[PDB]
Amino acid sequence: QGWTYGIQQDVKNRRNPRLVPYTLLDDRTKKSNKDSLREAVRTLLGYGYNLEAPDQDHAARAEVCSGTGERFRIFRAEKTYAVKAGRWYFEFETVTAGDMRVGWSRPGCQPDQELGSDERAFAFDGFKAQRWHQGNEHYGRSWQAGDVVGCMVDMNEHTMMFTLNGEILLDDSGSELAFKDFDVGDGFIPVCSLGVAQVGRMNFGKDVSTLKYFTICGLQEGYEPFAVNTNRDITMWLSKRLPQFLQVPSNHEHIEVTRIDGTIDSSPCLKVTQKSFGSQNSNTDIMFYRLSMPIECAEVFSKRDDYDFLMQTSTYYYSVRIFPGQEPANVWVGWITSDFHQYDTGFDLDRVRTVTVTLGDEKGKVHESIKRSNCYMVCAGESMSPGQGRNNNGLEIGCVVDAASGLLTFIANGKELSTYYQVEPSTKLFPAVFAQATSPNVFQFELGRIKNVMPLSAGLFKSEHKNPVPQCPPRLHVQFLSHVLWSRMPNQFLKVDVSRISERQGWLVQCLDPLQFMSLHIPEENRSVD
Amino acid sequence: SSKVQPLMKPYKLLSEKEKEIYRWPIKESLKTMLAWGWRIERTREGDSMALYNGYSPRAIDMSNVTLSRDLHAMAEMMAENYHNIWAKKKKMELESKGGGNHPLLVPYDTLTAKEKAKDREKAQDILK
Amino acid sequence: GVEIETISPGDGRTFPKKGQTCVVHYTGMLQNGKKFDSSRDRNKPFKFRIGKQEVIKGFEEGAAQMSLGQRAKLTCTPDVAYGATGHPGVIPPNATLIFDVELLNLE
Amino acid sequence: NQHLICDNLLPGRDLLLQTRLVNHVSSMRPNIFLGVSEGSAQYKKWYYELMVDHTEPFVTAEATHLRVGWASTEGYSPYPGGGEEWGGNGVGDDLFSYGFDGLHLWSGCIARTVSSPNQHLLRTDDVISCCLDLSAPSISFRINGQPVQGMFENFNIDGLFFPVVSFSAGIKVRFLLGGRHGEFKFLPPPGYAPCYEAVLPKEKLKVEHSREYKQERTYTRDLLGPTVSLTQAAFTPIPVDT
Ligand SMILES: Nc1ncnc2c1ncn2[C@@H]1O[C@H](COP(=O)(O)OP(=O)(O)OP(=O)(O)O)[C@@H](O)[C@H]1O
């Protein structure tokens, strides 16, 4: 009918406040229709027809409704605080009982790995009374809401013990120690992992009075607060929520980048292969690859090939060869900006972030309308027209960028595609490829040229600006979007005061204390860090 | 004698009798995968591709494409049936020669990885 | 060769006249957005006598067209800002300079 | 050699890592979580208004940050997608947020100069009207009652939008959310509804930090894990087949 939910009832705009889920439905209508249908059903029973209610089939969604694949957030102190000797103690407060882990982590713990699933952590899982180090063994009790977990380590004897509300937790047997055989290594750092909708609190012990069970269990034993002698609040690092682009590690489980030297009859190439494809534990997801160095457009847009045209042109080129056997529909070739941070298991060209900034004159006529995005790509599957055997030559999706006009043109197997983009001046575009590895050999980064177009290195490197010979200097390397990074919680935030003045005045926001940080900018990546 | 043959003309130029010997394997593969009740379907893209469609060397790289888990297991016993047909022919040969156990008369599972190579390339080749 | 966005309006009534010291409080950034100069960083109002070849062409004309108490953005093309030689170690050759200028006082 | 290395390395600012002193920028948003979806009960036109009571142009050597507009989340999570939890990033420094500073339209960390009667940066006693149209994706602004000659349009509509203001130190701003949460100083455009009508019947409207972590005592800081998607923010009636 066209009605809409609202906070009040207005028939003129077709807005009924009752348009809410039945769980949130108002009590009077809920009880009225409840008792009406109750009487109807119970009279239906009274007419002999016996209504057998089906059994309540138990179902569970595992309470996993977080952002994409994120399922926990790891909080740890800075790596420089790692302890290699002595006895230490810190408290973990469980605001909400649930899937939460706390313990000591080596200064190499990956932010995207469960605490204790590997050798880099020694955690206590009180949700299921588990002890985590390369595996789960039954240990201790299970906490409740408000319970305080006391984590204490003794590096002299290489032992760890845990306390729940002052009571020492034990193994399956009466053993007090939870972990008792480990090397010092690089030290240990307090760490906690929090599940979905889980709230926790760390008390490193900067103020001993704030500790709740240190004197109950941990003072006379010789253990010391982790921040007993510190003069500053301990910097705490938490797992980064926003994926970033970083170079493919040489020890990566799946990705394997091979640099191919350009011969006389060939061009420099960056072949991307998957190490563990076809074996059990193989990873089948969209891996987002880009090139470490961008192409910057002109500050002001202008309004047998000839060496002079090649010298005076500002057009650059790079090709991607989808290997014969890899699914073209799973490969996207194009350009991205530094703003691309969208890691989704299912990628399509229609869900990319975009916006059209329309600027008009006073009368309202649109004198210019500019479209903005961070992902200018094409899909190889739709790009490739002929079909069938692609084995005559690997699918070459040539990408042409006009750094003087901002026009992005794509050429596939010698024919120009209809898809094109128009970026703004001074836009920095990173050659990027998104591909799902359906084959050990996925794609390639051929850095050759076409007629009358400069190579990619000519725009990437200022020294090679007038060099028509394609090159692949070591600074240009294949990167990929990953979640294995840490983020530094600031030691001090802005002092913001919020309070509603009155009904007619509204909500007041007041910030007056100046706070500043000096940031470090990476020129080749167009990003800044503290 | 000189290892020269005229049989590398294009298939369209080959004679019809020379053609049966290539699809006898294809016909047998079709019979193998239809005797098990499998319904093979033709999608929209394949139908459209059909509606569109010495010599220059154009080599079909039939080595990089990889096959799904279920289809691989499916091809496992379908390659088993190829070995099974091989055992039929060599059992006829056994009956003709009146004895003498062949080294690979053993069931499919008793062969090793490098004894089982034919059934591989043929089986997942046609499935690829 | 320099146009002007006003950022904060001035009085609009008094403009620098000849031989008068102009006190400005500026911040100069390159086209890409990288800062290279700021009087606010040094915490010191910048003084120069107008029409007298003390500062660059573009800054001179922008301050001239400025009004008292105004805040404005100045865009200086290379021809009126350091030319094709540039400023050694600071300004690259053929660089457009963008200035955030405020005319505090005229003296 | 000292002169050559400097003149050949420093001016480029493309090899050595660059340093800059940046003001911290924080964001505040109400409890509103509005979005558009097929076969669901949400009003596609919303309107709120912001007032500036005080703003020092230069608290420090850097220009004071003050941006207002709309922001969207990634998916149906209550987390503003595609942004930093701290730093000098505000409304419009990503493709998930759209901002107005009195002189530019900010989106994706790129600013476009926008025309307006008596253009000026946001000052004291300036009233900004923000209008969001989700039927045809459109965001428009009105400064001191006069229309702003610019519009965001054709942006992604797959998440929850909310009013948002970003700022550095040295502001005094007031949210005028309509109804009993601040009376509008200008009439909403015809069709647009006040933002206080999107509040849930049990929940109460309040202006909170856009991000989870604030300035408070360290041992009392509440560490938050992943949050649950707001699947109840979009009431889509899907009855069983009959
Ligand atoms: N017997 C009934 N008569 C009328 N409405 C009913 C009845 N039973 C249920 N309803 C529901 O109650 C609502 C009636 O709201 P309606 O807009 O008519 O009333 P109102 O805004 O309170 O003012 P008024 O008293 O003038 O009708 C509708 O959602 C309708 O479906």
Burial class (CB in 10 A: 0-12, 13-18, 19+), D19: exposed
- Does residue A62's CB lie within 6 angstroms of at least one atom of ligand 1? no
Q: Using CA atoms, how far apart are residues A224 and A153, in angstroms rounded to an integer?
A: 10
Angle between helices B118-127 and B17-34 (to 10 degrees): 80
Burial class (CB in 10 A: 0-12, 13-18, 19+), B126: middle
- For chains D and C, tell me whether 3 or more CB atom pairs sit within 8 A of each other: yes
Angle between helices B69-97 and B118-127 (to 10 degrees): 140
- Does residue A11's CB lie within 6 angstroms of at least one atom of ligand 1? yes
| Cα A103 to averaged position of ligand 1 atoms, centre (Å) | 59
A509 close to D207: Cβ distance less than 8 angstroms:
yes
Place of tokens 């904060």: C8
Chain length of chain A: 530
- Interface probe for A, chosen from D219, D231, D232 (most Cβ of A below 10 Å), is D219
| Cα A9 to averaged position of ligand 1 atoms, centre (Å) | 11
C18: number of Cβ within 10 Å: 9
Query: CB under 8 Å, gap of 24 or more: what pairs does B46-50 form?
Result: B48/A387, B49/A387, B49/A388
Q: Using CA atoms, how far apart are residues A512 and A21, in angstroms rounded to an integer?
A: 42
Q: Is C11 a catalytic residue?
A: no
- Does residue A9's CB lie within 6 angstroms of at least one atom of ligand 1? yes
Q: Using CA atoms, how far apart are residues A147 and A139, in angstroms rounded to an integer?
A: 17
Q: Is C36 a catalytic residue?
A: yes
What's A80's DSSP letter?
G
> Which atom of ligand 1 has the smallest separation from the CA of A18?
29
Which of C15, C50, C99, C100 does the annotation list as catalytic?
C99
Say whether C15 sits in a helix, a strand or coil: coil
The partner residue sitting opposite A201, judged by closest CB among D74, D95, D220, is D220
Angle between helices B69-97 and B17-34 (to 10 degrees): 120
Q: Using CA atoms, how far apart are residues C105 and C20, in angstroms rounded to an integer?
A: 10
Q: Is C79 a catalytic residue?
A: no
Residue of C nearest to D115 (CA): C5
Answer left, alpha or beta for residue A430, where phi above 0 means left and psi between -120 and 50 means alpha.
beta
A194 close to D223: Cβ distance less than 8 angstroms:
yes
| Cα A15 to averaged position of ligand 1 atoms, centre (Å) | 13
Residues on chain D touching A514 (C-beta within 8 angstroms): 23, 59-60, 168-170
Distance from CA of D181 to the nearest CA of A (A): 5
Q: Which helix (H) or strand (E) holds A76?
A: strand A73-77
**Cα-to-chain-centroid distance, residue B89:** 16
Name the β-bridge partners of A100: A194
| Cα A27 to averaged position of ligand 1 atoms, centre (Å) | 16
- Interface probe for A, chosen from B47, B52, B65, B128 (most Cβ of A below 10 Å), is B65
Q: Which helix (H) or strand (E) holds D153?
A: strand D146-153
User: In D26-183, which residue ranges form alpha helices assigned H by DSSP?
Assistant: none
C48 close to C23: Cβ distance less than 8 angstroms:
no
Residues on chain D touching C27 (C-beta within 8 angstroms): 63
A269 close to A447: Cβ distance less than 8 angstroms:
yes
Residue C33, CB-side half-sphere exposure with 13 Å CA sphere? 9
**Cα-to-chain-centroid distance, residue A370:** 29
Q: Which residues contact A38 (CB under 8 A, 6 or more apart)?
A: none
The residue type at A440 = P
What's A79's DSSP letter?
G
Q: Using CA atoms, how far apart are residues A9 and A16, in angstroms rounded to an integer?
A: 5
Q: Is C56 a catalytic residue?
A: yes
Query: CB under 8 Å, gap of 24 or more: what pairs does D106-110 form?
Result: D106/D67, D106/D69, D107/A355, D107/A357, D107/A372, D107/D152, D107/D155, D108/A339, D108/A355, D108/A372, D108/A374, D109/A339, D110/A372, D110/A424
Residues on chain A touching D21 (C-beta within 8 angstroms): 516-519
Q: Using CA atoms, how far apart are residues A472 and A257, in angstroms rounded to an integer?
A: 14
φ, ψ (nearest 5 deg) of residue D198: -95, 5
Say whether A502 sits in a helix, a strand or coil: strand
B100: number of Cβ within 10 Å: 8
Q: Using CA atoms, how far apart are residues A152 and A252, in angstroms rounded to an integer?
A: 34
Say whether A238 sits in a helix, a strand or coil: strand
Q: Using CA atoms, how far apart are residues D62 and D21, in angstroms rounded to an integer?
A: 8
**Ligand 1 pocket, mutate which of A9, A14, A33, A36 (most atoms under 8 A from CB):** A9
Distance from CA of A329 to the nearest CA of B (A): 12
**Cα-to-chain-centroid distance, residue A405:** 33
| Cα A210 to averaged position of ligand 1 atoms, centre (Å) | 58
Answer left, alpha or beta for residue D69, where phi above 0 means left and psi between -120 and 50 means alpha.
left
Q: Using CA atoms, how far apart are residues A131 and D223, in angstroms rounded to an integer?
A: 22
CA angle A104, A106, A110 (to 5 degrees): 105
Q: Using CA atoms, how far apart are residues A55 and A141, in angstroms rounded to an integer?
A: 34
Does residue A124 belong to the interface with chain B, where contact is any CB pair within 8 Å?
no
CA-based max dimension of chain C: 40
Burial class (CB in 10 A: 0-12, 13-18, 19+), D43: buried
Q: How far is CA B9 from CA A392, B5, B15, B55, in A?
A: 19, 10, 10, 8
CA end-to-end span of chain A:
54
What's D52's DSSP letter?
E
Question: How many beta-carbon pairs under 8 angstroms link C with D?
Answer: 42
Q: Test A510 with D171 for CB contact under 8 angstroms.
A: yes
Q: Test A522 with D17 for CB contact under 8 angstroms.
A: yes
**Ligand 1 pocket, mutate which of A1, A3, A11 (most atoms under 8 A from CB):** A11
Residue of B nearest to A382 (CA): B45
Q: How far is CA D144 from CA C8, D103, D184, in A?
A: 16, 13, 12
**Cα-to-chain-centroid distance, residue A510:** 32
Q: Using CA atoms, how far apart are residues C27 and C35, in angstroms rounded to an integer?
A: 8
Residues D127-166 as b or e (16 or more Cβ within 10 Å = b): bbbbbbbbeebbbbbbbbeebbbbbbbbbbeebbbbbbbb
Residues on chain A touching B50 (C-beta within 8 angstroms): none
A352 close to A389: Cβ distance less than 8 angstroms:
no
Experimental technique behind these coordinates: cryo-EM
- For chains C and A, tell me whether 3 or more CB atom pairs sit within 8 A of each other: yes
Q: Test D105 with A71 for CB contact under 8 angstroms.
A: no
A371: tokens are 């479209």
Burial class (CB in 10 A: 0-12, 13-18, 19+), A227: buried
Residues in B whose CB is inside 8 Å of some CB of A read 45, 48-49, 52-53, 58-61, 63-66
- Does residue A251's CB lie within 6 angstroms of at least one atom of ligand 1? no
Q: Tell whether the torsion through CA atoms of D181, D184, D187 and D188 is positive or negative.
A: negative
Q: Which residues contact D31 (CB under 8 A, 6 or more apart)?
A: D199, D203, D204, D205, D206, D208
Does residue C3 belong to the interface with chain D, where contact is any CB pair within 8 Å?
no
CA end-to-end span of chain B:
36
- For chains D and B, tell me whether 3 or more CB atom pairs sit within 8 A of each other: no
Q: Using CA atoms, how far apart are residues B77 and B81, in angstroms rounded to an integer?
A: 6
Q: Test C88 with D18 for CB contact under 8 angstroms.
A: no
Which of C15, C26, C46, C59 does the annotation list as catalytic?
C26
Q: Using CA atoms, how far apart are residues A262 and A264, in angstroms rounded to an integer?
A: 7
Q: Using CA atoms, how far apart are residues D150 and D139, in angstroms rounded to an integer?
A: 9
Q: How far is CA A198 from CA A128, D8, D84, in A?
A: 15, 54, 21
Q: Test B59 with A323 for CB contact under 8 angstroms.
A: no
| Cα D177 to averaged position of ligand 1 atoms, centre (Å) | 29
| Cα A13 to averaged position of ligand 1 atoms, centre (Å) | 16
A485: tokens are 């990074």
Q: Is C48 a catalytic residue?
A: no
Q: Using CA atoms, how far apart are residues C20 and C66, in angstroms rounded to an integer?
A: 14
Q: Which residues contact C42 (CB under 8 A, 6 or more apart)?
A: none
Residues on chain D touching A495 (C-beta within 8 angstroms): 215
Residue A167, CB-side half-sphere exposure with 13 Å CA sphere? 9
- Interface probe for D, chosen from A509, A525, A529 (most Cβ of D below 10 Å), is A509
Q: Using CA atoms, how far apart are residues D131 and D195, in angstroms rounded to an integer?
A: 10
Residues on chain C touching A299 (C-beta within 8 angstroms): 31-32, 96
D121: number of Cβ within 10 Å: 19
| Cα D42 to averaged position of ligand 1 atoms, centre (Å) | 21
Q: How far is CA A466 from CA A37, A249, A302, A472, D3, in A?
A: 82, 33, 20, 15, 26
Residues on chain D touching A66 (C-beta within 8 angstroms): 77, 226-229
Which of C59, C82, C91, C100 does the annotation list as catalytic?
C82
Burial class (CB in 10 A: 0-12, 13-18, 19+), A152: buried
Place of tokens 């108002």: A26
Q: Which residues contact A466 (CB under 8 A, 6 or more apart)?
A: A311, A458
Say if strands A224-225 and A87-94 run parallel, antiparallel, or are unpaired. parallel
D215 close to A492: Cβ distance less than 8 angstroms:
yes
Q: How far is CA A519 from CA D10, D26, D235, in A?
A: 18, 16, 43
Q: Is C82 a catalytic residue?
A: yes
Place of tokens 């725009």: A459
Q: Using CA atoms, how far apart are residues B5 and B8, in angstroms rounded to an integer?
A: 7
φ, ψ (nearest 5 deg) of residue A487: -130, 135
Residue of A nearest to B50 (CA): A388
**Cα-to-chain-centroid distance, residue C55:** 8
Say whether B46 sits in a helix, a strand or coil: helix
Distance from CA of D95 to the nearest CA of C (A): 19
> Which atom of ligand 1 has the smallest separation from the CA of A11?
17
